[PDB]
Amino acid sequence: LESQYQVGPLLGSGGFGSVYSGIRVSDNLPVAIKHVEKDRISDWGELPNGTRVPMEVVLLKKVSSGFSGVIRLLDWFERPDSFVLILERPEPVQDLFDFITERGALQEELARSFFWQVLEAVRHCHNCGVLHRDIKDENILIDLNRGELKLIDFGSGALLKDTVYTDFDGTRVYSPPEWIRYHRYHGRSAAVWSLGILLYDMVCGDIPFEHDEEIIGGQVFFRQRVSSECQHLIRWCLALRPSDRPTFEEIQNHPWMQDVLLPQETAEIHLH
């Protein structure tokens, strides 16, 4: 490790863990090094070769094959009492929370581009057999030069299945009403809820629900000017009955999702 990567300062230590900035010696590639104690890992899994690792590592490996809108796992290590994860690091970079906080609600054209990229990245995960379970602004990075959104933190993920989930260790204010009322949910439909929350956030500059009475209420009030169509989609994604929510297909053929800008154009138009 220490001769191959050189550890720099500390990036964050919110939900993901203790993540530091690194530079890989061989080619000066920017990376992010995440450490995790073994004592604090609540959730284990096995690799293809049947090694016992953190689920995070398991899920990361599955999604890291191929180019996608997901930060890729490049390497990883086991130590006596921790595991170390080497990850991509865009530069310059900023998460979607800070972006929104600095700049207010995003214009619709921008939100569309971003939201699409999120959608696309999430479909990738599902195709790969992985359910993120913690989709939110804090877990989305923006390469500010390329206009590319990347998805992060598989610390609450799970293998994607078509049966019910009884556990959930994600974000409460992003969690759907089926979890609030019944501590039961299915992956995709839950995932769609969070994208409704996410979309709202982008266009309103804030999440729509603070409390549970609000969540299970299923009334969206818009604090900002949002087009009639974008509201329609948001309200659809946040439909109380899981079965009444759209599918990823249905979302991306929604009128509001049409004529998306390229990532590059988005950068030129909204980031430079």
Q: Toward ligand C2J, which CB reaches closer, 109 or 120?
A: 120
11 marked among binding-site residues: yes
> Is 134 among the residues known to form the active site?
yes
Q: Is the dihedral of CA 144, 145, 146, 147 positive or negative?
A: positive
**149 forms part of the interface with ligand C2J (CB under 6 A):** no
* Residue indicated by tokens 């689920």: 55
Binding-site member from 5, 20, 56, 119 for ligand C2J (CB under 6 A): 56
Size of the site for ligand C2J (CB under 6 A): 19
Q: Toward ligand C2J, which CB reaches closer, 100 or 226?
A: 100
205 marked among binding-site residues: no
For residue 11, the minimal CB distance to ligand C2J (Å) is 5
Which 34-53 positions form the footprint of ligand C2J (CB under 6 A)? 34
Contact by Cβ (8 Å): 133, 139: no
Q: Toward ligand C2J, which CB reaches closer, 54 or 177?
A: 54
Contact by Cβ (8 Å): 97, 138: yes
| Residue 115: both structure tokens together | 């939201």
**60 forms part of the interface with ligand C2J (CB under 6 A):** yes
Q: DSSP secondary structure string, 90-111? A: -SSEEEHHHHHHHH-SPPHHHH
The beta-strand segments (E) located in the chain are: 5-12, 18-24, 29-37, 44-46, 52-54, 73-78, 82-88, 93-95, 130-131, 140-143, 148-151, 158-159
**193 forms part of the interface with ligand C2J (CB under 6 A):** no
Terminal-to-terminal C-alpha distance of the chain? 37
**22 forms part of the interface with ligand C2J (CB under 6 A):** no
Q: What is the rounded CA–CA span in Å between residue 257 and residue 193?
A: 17
**155 forms part of the interface with ligand C2J (CB under 6 A):** yes
Out of 27, 43, 134, 212, pick the active-site residue: 134
**32 forms part of the interface with ligand C2J (CB under 6 A):** yes
Stretch of 12-20, 104-112, 168-176, 229-237 lying at the interface with ligand C2J (CB under 6 A):
12-20
Binding site as annotated, residues: 11-19, 34, 88, 95
